[PDB]
């Protein structure tokens, strides 16, 4: 089967970076084309009870701030086996059990700059979609509760340039109209900033969908990191969204924040981020949505890593506002 998401976004960004020319460069109107094509299939092998599964998803064909063209394999691309009793295993390039919860529901709408790849902690707070991964997805036991578990090689190890690795686990419990979410990921042997890091991230969250048209999510994220020179780093984050669905319309309000980072017990001032976001969506078809969105990003002011150089964050490029309309169509 061939499948795709046709997704187009017209986004105007107003920056406040402290540099005029930079504001002019980074800001403006762009088209963010996250359309992607994929191929996937199953196959029952004659001499293996679990069914063979595979997928090859392409990348964003023309994102904002990037050139045109995406290769096959940039997104979830894997082989695996699945069974009714014990779920499915996937080998390849998949989402981490934690990241899937960071991204959905907690990074929508436009909360990702703060909650996804934002934050100031050192090392690698978690992976987002990793190659060289094995991931187990249990079935929904008792149609109430599920487990996601994975281990994989790290970014450098996947090039023969390191020995980083990571493991992660996530669990969900269905409770009436509520979903309870908990996740963990630990990264090891991370070479960065002249050190070797260990990261440990914890996430708890709730999702609710109610017959009254209200739905919500909220997550609390706790990230610890330890360098090989004895330094300890800590940062917390949160994200929440409030939704009213009436007829063909969805009103959604979103807020996410990273809090001050702690280095060796000392709070670092102005290492916090937050984003406020509002979105109106129209269910234009059972397979498509239109949406309008505005958001406000307030980023940290910068911090040095452990190598006496500036450490990159999602705020490095500066605070900005974004106004956008878009379309998403699934097939």
């Amino acid at each position: 089967e061939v499948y795709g998401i046709i997704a187009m976004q017209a986004a105007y960004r107003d920056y406040d970076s402290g540099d005029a020319k930079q504001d002019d460069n980074l800001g403006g109107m762009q088209l963010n084309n996250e359309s992607r094509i994929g191929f996937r299939g199953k196959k029952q092998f004659a001499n293996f009870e679990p069914t063979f599964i595979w997928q090859i998803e392409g990348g964003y064909v023309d994102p904002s701030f990037g050139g045109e063209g995406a290769g096959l394999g940039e997104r979830d691309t894997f082989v695996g086996f699945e069974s009714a009793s014990w779920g499915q295993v996937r080998l390849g390039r998949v989402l981490t059990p934690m990241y899937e919860l960071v991204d959905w529901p907690a990074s929508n709408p436009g909360l990702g700059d703060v909650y996804d790849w934002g934050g100031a902690i050192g090392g690698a707070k978690y992976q987002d979609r990793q190659s060289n991964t094995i991931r187990w997805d249990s079935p929904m036991y008792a149609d109430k509760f599920s487990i996601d578990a994975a281990v994989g090689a790290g970014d450098k190890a996947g090039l023969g340039a390191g020995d980083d690795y990571w493991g992660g686990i996530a669990a969900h419990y269905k409770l009436g109209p509520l979903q309870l979410d908990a996740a963990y990921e630990g990264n090891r042997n991370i070479e960065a900033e002249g050190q070797t890091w260990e990261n440990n991230t914890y996430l708890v969250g709730v999702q609710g969908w109610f017959e009254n048209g209200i739905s919500f999510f909220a997550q609390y994220k706790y990230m610890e990191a330890d360098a090989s020179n004895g330094v300890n780093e800590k940062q917390d984050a949160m994200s929440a969204g409030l939704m009213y669905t009436t007829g063909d319309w969805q009103y959604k309000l979103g807020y996410a924040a990273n809090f001050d980072l702690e280095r060796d017990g000392k709070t670092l001032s102005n290492t916090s981020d937050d984003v406020v976001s509002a979105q109106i969506m129209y269910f234009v078809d059972p397979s498509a949505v239109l949406y309008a969105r505005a958001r406000m990003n307030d980023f940290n002011e910068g911090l040095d890593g452990l190598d006496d150089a500036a450490r990159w964050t999602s705020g490095t490029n500066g605070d900005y506002n974004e106004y956008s309309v878009g379309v998403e169509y699934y097939f």
Partner: peptide, 6 residues
């Protein structure tokens, strides 16, 4: 899904 790290 995914990131934008640097």
């Amino acid at each position: 899904d995914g990131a934008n790290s640097d």
